[PDB]
Specification:
Distance between the termini of chain C: 13 Å
Distance between the termini of chain B: 22 Å
PDB class: chaperone
Chains: A alpha/beta, B alpha/beta, C alpha/beta
Keywords: TRiC/CCT, phosducin-like protein, chaperone
Entry title: yeast TRiC-plp2-substrate complex at S1 TRiC-NPP state
CATH superfamily of one domain in chain C: GroEL
Radius of gyration of chain C: 30 Å
Oligomer: part of a larger assembly
Strand content of chain B: 15-25%
Organism of A: Saccharomyces cerevisiae
Helix content of chain B: 10-25%
Largest sheet of chain B: 5 strands, mixed
Chain A: T-complex protein 1 subunit zeta
Number of strands of chain C: 14
Shape of chain C: elongated
Chain lengths: 534, 132, 518
């Protein structure tokens, strides 16, 4: 009962293959869970090596041969487009759920019963999530909570040393773009830049924008205080006769004379620019003048600008000009003849940074730039990639926390509490039937994988840590008090996540649980494997 | 008009880049011509190049579908080259292959065409491709 | 090359069984999922029976024939895509030992299968229960089963009404001894296509008792509302006409080029007068219409529509009765499409309309669907197609049969009881068919996670000693009354599934060898 050029799995072979693939994927992503996890090394074969820990990036870049593993990875990748985190959690939950389901199936439990039990446990876990969350306040002085959230997000991705650098940077960058008002949050207001030949710890935060192109004249001021930003779209390069002409001569002296005569066109515009500079705070103290000049500038015009204590850039990207239109408030002048003071903007200190391979300009310290820039600094490609990924993850986590005020303490407290709540309530109710108890117990046990994996990664024995956490929870319940009990990966004993400062996003946990349950149900319902199209 | 081709043409290796390369043309009165450039302003000819092996199922199915298309799509060029005479070491694992050219450039590289529509490919699967 | 003896029959039966076993688990709400693995790295976990039977490649010709049968039934009938294959495969498997072990000739098996088909149809008719096809409440309740628990669950309330109204508009309930029973001549594919109108809500959707045309007036100075419309259809364009052979225009003076325009005016005026001779109110031409023709037709007091596709005229001739004449000079007074309702062009949702409805029964209509987005419109269109197919199945026979395998179990029991009294060699295939009918309840029990043996035995005992309305519960998995739980399926689907499965089994049994040939 088969056809050529095809292969199929019969009886329970499909279930065994799917379970094995899920276990393999879990073991692949088991070691990188939590701040105590490890990093994976990826080689593309072209000489580029990536050292990454984020589950989404690892799944996207890594090639997967097992079709079931491919399906699991693709399903878990949805977390990135919804919550931005929890892919590893989804994979671990799917793996443990499939392990338990296979164990029960070996005892004769039909897959549909397990699926129904998983659905019931999912509903109960959603109820527990609703009852267990903590409402965050809307106070504008919540900077401490944002710092705690950023630290929690970063510790999972960094070596615990760059955390002190990235936490304040991420917190400030996210807070500046989203003021203490309803409005809205858009992470596109935060620019991400990378620089080479610098120490990893050099990463800093810039209030405003940073321009790639720098000055090209030694006499330009290094720093300009309270500068007026001028954006000019008219090219200041050498101009020729407006009508048909040429350079026909017997000696280069005639060509030089013709060039000097033709330079008057640029000279006239330079005169207007200098007049504007002089009129607007020409000699006022603590004032400056900076010109962007999107288009190119002739060296003679650069020297003319420098001799007037004017810092002029050239050959800037249109995107940079559009960003400056808001960062500095200045407008782009299409024609010098219509140039007027109203075009000029205003900005704080303007500093030029010289690098061996390039030169940057800073246009930060703006009254209301409605944007900010984060400068990732590193000496190696992998370090820069890791820093960028950590910064983006922290930005997304803080944005999710700000937009969604529902906050749930982490440190493994949520998973253990949910497992206990399920084991109690589902067994006390038995709302569907006894036969669903197998699936209920499987789901409850699988939900405990995350704390066990975290403890295993931290090097401590999961049994003792789980026993201590359960004992503390039992004591709290006997005391008739509300208490959150988590896992301290540094000491090994139990700890209160609300005091240490470990928190998890409501959306992340909700989506991870839903996705894991859905993937487990879909895989457990696979009766056979079919091959076609060959 | 012009009803240019009307049938599938056999290609020998020496003329592959002549018959396929010649996608890059129109004809007199089918487009604008200009100063020191006699090329049409419009595009060229869609050329459907079949790399076949007689032993394979889909190759036999496509020989039928390609000629059937050629009989109606008079303006579309259809050609066939034994795959083993097109590519040095042509692998059976890619067989059959269809490459679609236009205006001298490559548009599609469809590989193991048994999955390009039904295993028992119908003219409905091929006419749905030819309109994409 | 050539196969002789029982080997060819064994090969065909094995191919049929292999095809059936794949989808054996595609029945019931508890249907299991399947993995489709392409030669590339992509795969899906779709559980749709049609998708499984479409994406599965089979080399054996019998499997290809079975897949083609299922694909054809997927459009001929609204349901039973997987039931037909499962039933045919089970019947073939049951009949296999008789052909192989009992040395029974295929002709006897085929005849017995046909007789069992007749008996099964009789039993299905006996066990079916009537429904009220005239009361809208009962039809809405029945059709809600195929509309709820879907993307259109939100608008189900109005979706049921829209589908029922469309089906009734295309449904012709007639009964007499002169023309016979038309069988309602319901055609959804051709004359029920849904028109997607952006904007509005589902509750705003209406059923048009005719054809809706999206072609606006070809000239602003044209009537937009006729209370006594009459449609005339033509193909030949109203413009300058050349000779059948090569035609050449030779002009000496520049001012003489107006001769072509004068000839065009004369010909167009003659054609327009010929068209107007039949007292028309709207002129529809498949080919292009010149501005002069539009002016001449307007002078006659009628509207003009040009470059209208044949698809619109095919339905216009059905809802208006207008006869299309290729040549204008051959137009006849009797070709005018009288008995037309209106030419109202009221715009809905910033879209152009042209209603050709009436209070007649042309067995054609148009569904004016409204929605807040294109995705909603497409999903509602698909759900309305499914609901109208279900409603057509229900209304084609005012009765329904119990679901959950109760009908199959009752058919098996009655077939066994009747076969016990036949007293002939054919008794064996009748028992084989009766046993194969048990496939559906076995699949339901297996999908529900119950006991495949004890539950089936209890159901069979209940049917033998109790009523035939007992079946397998989709959720509980126990034996319960289908009527109490509201589990039902249309009788038409069951009859068609049984007939098609038995006919396919007979056809496959007829083939006793596969030989090379071109």
């Amino acid at each position: 009962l088969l056809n050529p050029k095809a292969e199929s799995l019969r009886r329970d072979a499909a279930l065994k293959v799917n379970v094995t693939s899920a276990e393999g994927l879990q073991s692949v992503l088991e070691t990188n869970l939590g701040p105590k996890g490890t990093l994976k090394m990826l080689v593309d074969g072209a000489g580029n090596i990536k050292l990454t820990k984020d589950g989404k990036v690892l799944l996207t870049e890594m090639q997967i041969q097992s079709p079931t593993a491919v399906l699991i990875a693709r399903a878990a990748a949805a977390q990135d487009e919804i919550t931005g985190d929890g892919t590893t959690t989804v994979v671990c939950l799917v793996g443990e759920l499939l392990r338990q389901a296979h164990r029960f199936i070996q005892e004769g439990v039909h897959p549909r019963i397990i699926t129904d039990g998983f659905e019931i446990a999912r509903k109960e876990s959603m109820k527990f999530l609703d009852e267990f969350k903590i409402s965050k306040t809307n106070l504008s002085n919540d900077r401490e909570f944002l710092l705690q959230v950023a630290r929690s997000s970063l510790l999972t991705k960094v070596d615990a040393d760059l955390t002190e650098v990235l936490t304040p940077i991420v917190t400030d960058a996210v807070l500046s773009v989203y003021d203490a008002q309803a409005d809205n949050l858009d992470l596109h207001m935060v620019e991400i830049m990378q620089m080479q030949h610098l120490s990893p710890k050099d990463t800093t935060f810039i209030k405003g924008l940073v321009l790639d192109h720098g000055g090209r004249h030694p006499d330009m001021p290094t720093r300009v205080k309270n500068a007026y930003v001028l954006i000019l779209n008219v090219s200041l390069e050498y101009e020729k006769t407006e009508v048909n002409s040429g350079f026909f001569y017997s000696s280069a002296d005639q060509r030089d004379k013709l060039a000097a005569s033709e330079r008057k066109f640029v000279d006239a515009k330079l005169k207007k620019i200098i007049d504007l500079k002089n009129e607007v705070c020409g000699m006022d103290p603590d004032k400056g003048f900076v010109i962007i000049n999107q288009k190119g500038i002739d060296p003679m015009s650069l020297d003319v600008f420098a001799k007037h204590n004017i810092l002029a850039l050239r050959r800037a990207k249109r995107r940079n000009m559009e960003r400056l239109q808001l960062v500095t408030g200045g407008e782009a002048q299409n024609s010098v003849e219509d140039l007027s003071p109203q075009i000029l903007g205003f900005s704080g200190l303007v500093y030029q940074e010289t690098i061996g391979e390039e030169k940057f300009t800073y246009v930060t310290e703006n009254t209301d730039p409605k944007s900010c820039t984060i400068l990732i600094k590193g000496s190696t490609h992998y370090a820069l990639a890791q820093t960028k990924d950590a910064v983006r993850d922290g930005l997304r986590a803080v944005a999710n926390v700000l937009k969604d005020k529902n906050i749930i303490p982490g440190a493994g407290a949520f998973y253990i509490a949910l497992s206990r709540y399920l084991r109690s309530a589902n067994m006390n109710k038995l709302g569907a039937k006894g036969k669903t108890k197998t699936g209920i117990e499987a789901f409850a046990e699988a939900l405990l994988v995350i704390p066990k994996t975290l403890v295993k990664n931290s090097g401590f024995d999961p049994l003792d840590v789980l026993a201590m956490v359960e004992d503390e929870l039992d004591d709290a319940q006997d005391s008739d008090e509300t208490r959150y009990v988590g896992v301290d990966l540094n000491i090994g004993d139990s700890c209160d996540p609300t005091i240490e400062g470990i928190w998890d996003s409501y959306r992340v946990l909700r989506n991870a649980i839903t996705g894991a349950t859905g993937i487990a149900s879909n895989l457990l319902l696979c009766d056979e494997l079919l091959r076609a199209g060959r | 008009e012009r009803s240019k081709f009307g049938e599938v043409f056999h290609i020998n290796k020496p003329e592959y880049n002549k018959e396929v390369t010649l996608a890059s043309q129109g004809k007199k009165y089918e487009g604008a011509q200009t100063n020191d450039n006699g090329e049409e302003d419009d595009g060229g000819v869609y050329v459907f190049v079949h790399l076949s092996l007689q032993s394979k199922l889909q190759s036999r199915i496509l020989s039928h579908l390609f000629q059937s298309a050629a009989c109606k799509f008079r303006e579309i060029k259809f050609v066939e080259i034994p795959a083993n005479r097109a590519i040095e070491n042509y692998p059976e694992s890619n067989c059959p292959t269809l490459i679609v050219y236009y205006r001298g450039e490559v548009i599609k590289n469809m590989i193991t065409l048994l999955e390009l529509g039904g295993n028992n490919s119908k003219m409905e699967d091929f006419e749905d491709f030819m309109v994409k | 090359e050539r196969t002789t003896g029982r080997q060819a029959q064994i090969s065909n039966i094995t191919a049929a069984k292999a095809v059936a076993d794949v989808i054996r688990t595609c029945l019931g709400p508890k249907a299991m999922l399947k993995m489709l693995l392409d030669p590339m790295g992509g795969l899906v976990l779709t559980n749709d029976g049609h998708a499984i039977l479409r994406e599965i490649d089979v080399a054996h010709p019998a499997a290809k024939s079975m897949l083609e049968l299922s694909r054809t039934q997927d459009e001929e009938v609204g349901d039973g895509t997987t039931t037909v294959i499962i039933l045919a495969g089970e019947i073939l498997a049951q009949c296999a030992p008789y052909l192989i072990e009992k040395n029974i000739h295929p002709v006897i098996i085929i005849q017995a299968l046909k007789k069992a088909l007749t008996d099964a149809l009789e039993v299905i008719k006996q066990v079916s229960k009537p429904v009220d096809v005239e009361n809208d409440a009962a039809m809405k309740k029945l059709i809600q089963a195929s509309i709820g628990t879907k993307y259109v669950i939100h608008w189900s309330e109005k979706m049921c009404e829209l589908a029922l109204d469309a089906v009734k508009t295309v449904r012709k309930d007639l009964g007499q001894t002169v023309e016979g029973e038309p069988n309602f001549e319901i055609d959804i594919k051709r004359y029920v296509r849904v028109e997607k109108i952006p904007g509005g809500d589902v509750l705003d959707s209406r059923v048009l008792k005719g054809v809706l045309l999206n072609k606006d007036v070809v000239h602003p100075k044209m009537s937009r509302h006729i209370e006594n419309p009459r449609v005339v259809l033509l193909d030949c364009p109203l413009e300058y006409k050349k000779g059948e052979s090569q035609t050449n225009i030779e002009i000496e003076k520049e001012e003489d080029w107006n001769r072509i325009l004068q000839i065009e005016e004369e010909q167009v005026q003659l054609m327009c007068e010929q068209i107007l001779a039949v007292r028309p109110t709207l002129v529809i031409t498949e080919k292009g219409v010149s501005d002069l023709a539009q002016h001449y037709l307007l002078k006659g007091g009628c509207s003009v529509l040009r470059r209208v596709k044949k698809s619109d005229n095919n339905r216009i001739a059905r809802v208006t009765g207008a006869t299309i004449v290729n040549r204008v000079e051959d137009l006849k007074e009797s070709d005018v499409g009288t008995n037309c309702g209106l030419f109202k062009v009221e715009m809905i949702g910033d879209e152009y309309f042209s209603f050709l409805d009436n209070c007649k029964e042309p067995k054609a209509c148009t569904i004016m669907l409204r929605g807040g987005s294109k995705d909603i419109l497409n999903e509602i269109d698909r759900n309305l197609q499914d609901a109208m197919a279900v409603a057509r199945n229900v209304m084609l026979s005012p009765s329904l049969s119990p679901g959950g395998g109760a009908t199959e179990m009752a058919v098996s029991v009655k077939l066994a009881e009747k076969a016990k009294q036949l007293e002939g060699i054919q008794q064996w295939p009748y028992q084989a068919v009766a046993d194969a009918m048990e496939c559906i309840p076995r699949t339901l029990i297996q999908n529900a996670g119950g006991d495949p043996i004890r539950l089936l035995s209890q159901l069979r005992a209940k049917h033998a000693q109790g009523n035939f309305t007992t079946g397998i519960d989709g959720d509980k998995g126990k034996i319960v009354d289908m009527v109490s739980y509201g589990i039902w399926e249309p009788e038409v689907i069951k009859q068609q599934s049984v007939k098609t499965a038995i006919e396919s089994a007979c056809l496959l049994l007829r083939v006793d060898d596969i030989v090379s040939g071109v």
